[PDB]
Amino acid sequence: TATYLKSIMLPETGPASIPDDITERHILKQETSSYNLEVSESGSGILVCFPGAPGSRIGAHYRWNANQTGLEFDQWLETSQDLKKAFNYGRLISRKYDIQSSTLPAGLYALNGTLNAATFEGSLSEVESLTYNSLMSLTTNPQDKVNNQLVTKGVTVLNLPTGFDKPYVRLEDETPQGLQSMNGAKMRCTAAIAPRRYEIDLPSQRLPPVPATGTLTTLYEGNADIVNSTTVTGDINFGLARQPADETTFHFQLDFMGLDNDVPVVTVVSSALATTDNHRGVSAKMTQSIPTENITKPITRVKLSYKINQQTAIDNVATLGTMGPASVSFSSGNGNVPGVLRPITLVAYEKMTPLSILTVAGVSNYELIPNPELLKNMVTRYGKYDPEGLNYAKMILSHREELDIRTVWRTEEYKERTRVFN
Amino acid sequence: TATYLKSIMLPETGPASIPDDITERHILKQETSSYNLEVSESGSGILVCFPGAPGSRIGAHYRWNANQTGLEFDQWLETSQDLKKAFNYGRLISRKYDIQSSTLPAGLYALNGTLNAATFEGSLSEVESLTYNSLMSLTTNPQDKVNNQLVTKGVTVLNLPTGFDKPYVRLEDETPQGLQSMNGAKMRCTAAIAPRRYEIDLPSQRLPPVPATGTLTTLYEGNADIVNSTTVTGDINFGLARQPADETTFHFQLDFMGLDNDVPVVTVVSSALATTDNHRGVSAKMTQSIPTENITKPITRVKLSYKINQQTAIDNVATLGTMGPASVSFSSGNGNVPGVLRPITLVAYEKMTPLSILTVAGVSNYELIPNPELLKNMVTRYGKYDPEGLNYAKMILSHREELDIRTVWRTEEYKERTRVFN
Amino acid sequence: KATATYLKSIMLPETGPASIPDDITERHILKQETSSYNLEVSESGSGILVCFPGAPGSRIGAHYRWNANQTGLEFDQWLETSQDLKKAFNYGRLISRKYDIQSSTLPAGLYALNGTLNAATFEGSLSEVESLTYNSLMSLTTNPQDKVNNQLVTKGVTVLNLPTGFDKPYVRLEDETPQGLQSMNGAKMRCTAAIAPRRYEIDLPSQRLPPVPATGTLTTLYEGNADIVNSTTVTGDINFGLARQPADETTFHFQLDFMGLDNDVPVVTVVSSALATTDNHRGVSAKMTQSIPTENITKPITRVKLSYKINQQTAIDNVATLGTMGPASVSFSSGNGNVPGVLRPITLVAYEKMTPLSILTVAGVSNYELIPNPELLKNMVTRYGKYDPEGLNYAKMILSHREELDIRTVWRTEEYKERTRVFNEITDFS
Amino acid sequence: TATYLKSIMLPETGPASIPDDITERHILKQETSSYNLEVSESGSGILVCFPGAPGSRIGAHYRWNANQTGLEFDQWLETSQDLKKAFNYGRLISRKYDIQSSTLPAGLYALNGTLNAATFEGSLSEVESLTYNSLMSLTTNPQDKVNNQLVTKGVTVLNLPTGFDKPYVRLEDETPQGLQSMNGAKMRCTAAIAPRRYEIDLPSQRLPPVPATGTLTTLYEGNADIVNSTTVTGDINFGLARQPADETTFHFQLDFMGLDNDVPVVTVVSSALATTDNHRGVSAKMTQSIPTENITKPITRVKLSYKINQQTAIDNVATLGTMGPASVSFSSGNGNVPGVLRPITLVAYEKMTPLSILTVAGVSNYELIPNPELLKNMVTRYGKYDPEGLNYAKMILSHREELDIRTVWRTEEYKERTRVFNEI
């Protein structure tokens, strides 16, 4: 008994079936991650942990440039194997990170570098400043924060479950295909189980005047965050004042960006054509679908903008909404599943010794469902019937202030404070 | 212990956390709502209650016209605070309404009025007639109806949970927008979790003829309820019979109306064009996205139309369904979340004294999740760990008939039968 | 008690004044000034009473009434004292205040009248209220001692004033100064209130000005919420550089009109002009050096709208980016608005659905310690306080224990009337 | 009782409400800072502290260039949370910094660095020489200095109050704005309570001749310090000696700088067309308003310059004061509030190995008044009513010298010498 709470508290002692009502025929599997990140020239950076995200991507790694004016995206933090090549559905029992430098000092003093870590029950886009200083100002729970820990003593980022009846989620696997496919066109059973919808929702005023032809004047830019395949559904209707002398195109842009620099991860264009016939209602439909492989890095910003090609019609005010709401939306995968996009843990290091080694070390315990190619050889069973295992975890989570269990640790307060679940 | 049932029966005794499986870090907040409703000169009107809606709108009010020929929308019933300005996610614990008049104007001797209240497991597009005598047939459950109740004694509308593992729902809040937006564009993380889709499915026969140019003849009209943002998908495709002599437009309409009058709440237009080339493959696509702020009143009817702009094209039958099924879909928000749009509680008052006042006092109990601005200055924790208490609140929901645990009460029998729950 | 004389003036402001026993010790004059209003309820049967509890002065509140169809409000009148203080005095603090709002129609039969009354104390400035609505003002505070909802309009509500701070300064009262016989006809200098101002800055960004639709059509630049209640000075400038030198002389009006919270006709507007010419087309500064007397502030100001317009039909494509000759902003500082009590905190009393043509009575009372003007300074003796050492210290523990003692800024007038007798009103016989 | 002096003495033990006369409903909130400053190649620098500033900017950091001829602004130091976004008014209760190195870079096996510190009472622009060993000659109070302290042991800076009835200060936050705002404009409720005003007072003699057209001659250069929103008022009025053959503009600058390097932090402009009619009464109005996001780094200098745009106008002497005193004033925020702009505490470091880390750890305590959105959900209340409260705190400040209560400590002395104050 109580072999599921022990797997939450100690995620490296192996997986265990979530003893809840969503009982399927699954596979218990533990997957690890091992990185040796080379500290950049400014010795500073931030690594975003998604501790409850069921999948292969468990984190991202950004690093400050020399002047610490901006960040650069180093790489994702995946697991050992890409789970979608042998599994179609998956959950997450447990996860644990060990962010800790591996540079043993010879002398009696430590090398220079510290760690701030905060569990922010929001999303990456909702953070206003990503900086080692302004991380304590993301929560107020004393169990979600750790400040000024030596980088050679390390922080353990536990994952405390956010809900207990989470659904098995598609892993973006690939379907069989024929031999007459194009060359590299594939098809995926992507994630769509509880989407996260956004909507730019422009008002019914005139379009801003563009300074020149083909200059891409901005219409809106906000903070929406995206991790996997999205569908863009909307339209941008507008009526011109006077019928155009020539015919104008009205290019619309909608590019997506990251939190580090203004080079668009994905851009998605729609076009119109203002003609003498339809000069009173023109519509540019956004019906584009964005696969999950074009998202090379996390997305935290969108920007909608437009440009016109005709030299004239630069004074053709073109009021919006002449055929309806004039709104553009997009929906994304499993954004609104507890664990994806929310919550997140931020671990930031400052002034680590230039060209030294930070070693992240992750452990995940999944509940997976093999793909048909693997059912031939893998036996799939049910949960092991723990009747009390979830009440015990609910009791542990409800008293996390007296017992001082926490999402983020000091790795030595952790290594010492959890040997009672053995 | 047994403190979650107390918050169901006595929504005024404050909120208690749901002991179900979804365990988050939340905020227990109570909201009140108090309205003094002017009664029209007819005296009749009708209230709509959404006793399970987790949002910030808890009902609507319609007032019959001078001779009960039609209704008119009065206003939305909502809570005191606008939850979507300080919170992101939320789910409802319990709610309670209290109706009465019990007061009359300066010099008057006659106080007359009666109440019919019945809980309906439909969605208010399902109701056929909202008249005072009608809505006693909306259910055949004994403990869901109250008829011929004196307006001075009033009805208390309770809320019984239709399910327990409800998900937290995005409250349609604005996202942090950068500069360079145009003037008033704004993006909201709308609701997507468990939507409600309506397929139109026009049959692939001849398009009915227009009597004249630009007169908007009907293609379909029906009942479908929408309260939050929605996205419209599909396309009407059709091939002309011979060939267009000159270019025609085929302007499609798709208006949305409420139950009171026939002025559309919001209209989404899509305009095709039949040229000589595509004269057998004309297609009018629907991609519009309706923000949840264009829904001013409860939408209950949908009507699709079309019209042409050329005289020569009254003939040229223009058969549907050449390129595909020629259908039109639209999905909305949390339509299929149990609590939104289901169930409804109708409360009909009948011939109150003209120019008298009806009193609606509601108290909701939510479990909210703050927004990043509020996370820094507010502690968010887990539930109180009632191990039982869900079973204790589910035994009552099953023995409700031998316990007479009602959804609609007479205020005087409620105010004394529920004192057993401390 | 020998002590508890100052506290007795806060809890029972009807029983006359009592000098504030703080460190601001001047030779002053104790005065009690009363307010009385019988308000004619309008056909909407609804309205709002914006109280100003800690406001030292004559104006102690405002009365707004909803229009017929309950869409927007209308400004009835200022709620002030019976006699004008600034005629006889020069300086003043406020010791305590109390408002009593009540329906004086009082039905004859067995059923009460249809009128209900909401009241909440908001630690804001009447521009920080997103919406004034009978339902909307029950979530303005979580403090249970600042909220009363669903009070029957005949039983009434009491709005007690609790001091926020104790070393408040003596503020000038906008008395007008002596003048020679050569003034034109209506000029008058006033010693206006300027001690601890509240400042706003509109802060335009340094980029292209929005395009104007036509000539003289007043394009909007900014509109937000900034409450002003007395005299103010506008200080700023707007500068811009034209794309290319103009074909003619463009004027570029700027409007900056202040607006109340009820209708969009400006309470006061003030215009500046910058004539862009051939030579100085690269920098065109519109100086904003304005001073609005409190005599122009007719009703409470809650919103602002900065707008502009050009007069040449040409030059309508001269994009005119801002910020050339510096930050390109405009500012206006108003009176003594950061003095605690002025503009914050305020109390809102909403009456909803009363009988039209019924009567709503309002009976204020305000104890001041004032300083006479020279005219009656030759007849009144001004002296120091009463020397109660523990007077302030006794009131400090009352405010700190106001939860367990249940000391409220908003009452039901039957729990106020019955719960304020421990503060002596009982005449212990000799 | 005695629970407020404990907060002044040991700020790390949490905030406590001030027992003074300013009694308003408020929120007690403790905010931390954490900084790892990078020592440059000169191994030197200076770390300014604003121990009593109720805002969010609690200090700047400077470095000395290679040959120590001048400084360079590195960065502001500031609380983790941006207070203005969730609060309108605030008062500071306590604030303690903490400075050390205690660690070493890659290829180093010996650490070295010494550390001067002194509690000034001017305003960061009244100091004349700001070198490592000159800031010892800025005070004579033994309780306000520490000399040649090893950087590995550390200097603690403590905030002893200067006054007790400080008002709640506006935190410069946003106001609600409706639609129709142009693109990115924004109105803020800035600080104005107790301003600080300078005036440049030019004499009514002739303007100094300009060398060439458009060459920016200098009229005044001096030391004034600004940290927030500033209004400029005044005018320069002059009369040309004779008829101007061609109209001149007379560009007047008045730009502001920091102490690091003479690049303008904020520059302003005013022009005065001298035409043939008003050549007896030309005047250049100055009516600008400088918001607080333009003050990117501390300002400690102003320069008022001018220039002409015509060739013939280099003669025609243009004497000042023809229509009045001809001065240019500017009043800034709430400079004269005790705690803002004074007292300053400077901590200088030198002889440190380049690329080593200088750790700063601040912890502040505030009384804050939540903004309307946060006000709807959090409850505000009054002080905790300690009647004596201040007399105990006021007693220690008077017995400062015999009890040795310092603003600038050395850490090992601070850690143990102040354990006395652990009692509730």
Numbering used by the authors:
A (entry chain E), B (entry chain D): 7 to 428
C (entry chain C): 5 to 434
D (entry chain B): 7 to 430
What does the study report here?
The infectious pancreatic necrosis virus (IPNV), a member of the Aquabirnavirus, can infect diverse salmonid species, leading to lethal outcomes characterized by pancreatic necrosis and catarrhal enteritis. Birnaviruses have a bi-segmented dsRNA genome. On the contrary, VP2s assemble into a 60–70 nm T=13 icosahedral single-layer capsid to protect the RNPs. The VP2 subunits are organized into three domains: the α-helix-rich N and C-terminal base (B) domain located on the capsid interior; the conserved β-barrel jelly roll fold shell (S) domain; and the unique β-barrel jelly roll fold projection (P) domain, which is situated on the capsid exterior.
The first infectious IPNV capsid structure was determined at a resolution of 2.75 Å using cryo-EM single particle analysis with imposed icosahedral symmetry. From another perspective, five subunits (a) form a pentagonal unit at the 5-fold axis, while the remaining subunits contribute to hexagonal units in the capsid. While the overall structure of the VP2 subunits is similar, notable structural variations are observed in the C-terminal region of the B domain (residues 429–435) and the variable loop region of the S domain (residues 110–117) (5-fold, down, and up conformations). A comparison between the cryo-EM structures of the infectious T=13 IBDV and IPNV particles similarly reveals differences in these surface loops, reinforcing earlier observations made from the T=1 structures. Both IPNV and IBDV form four corresponding surface loops: L1 (IPNV: 206–222, IBDV: 204–222), L2 (IPNV: 245–260, IBDV: 245–260), L3 (IPNV: 277–287, IBDV: 277–284), and L4 (IPNV: 313–323, IBDV: 313–322), while an additional loop, L4′ (326-334), is unique to IPNV. However, the variable loop of the other 12 VP2 subunits in the asymmetric unit adopts either an up or down conformation, contributing to the formation of the necessary structural interfaces within the hexagonal capsomers in the T=13 capsid lattice. The Tyr115 residues of the three up conformations largely contribute to forming the interface. Specifically, this intensity was observed from Glu429 to Ser435 in subunit (a), Glu429 to Ile430 in subunit (b), and Glu429 to Ser434 in subunit (c). The C-terminal extensions create an additional hydrophobic interface and interlock with neighboring subunits on the capsid interior.
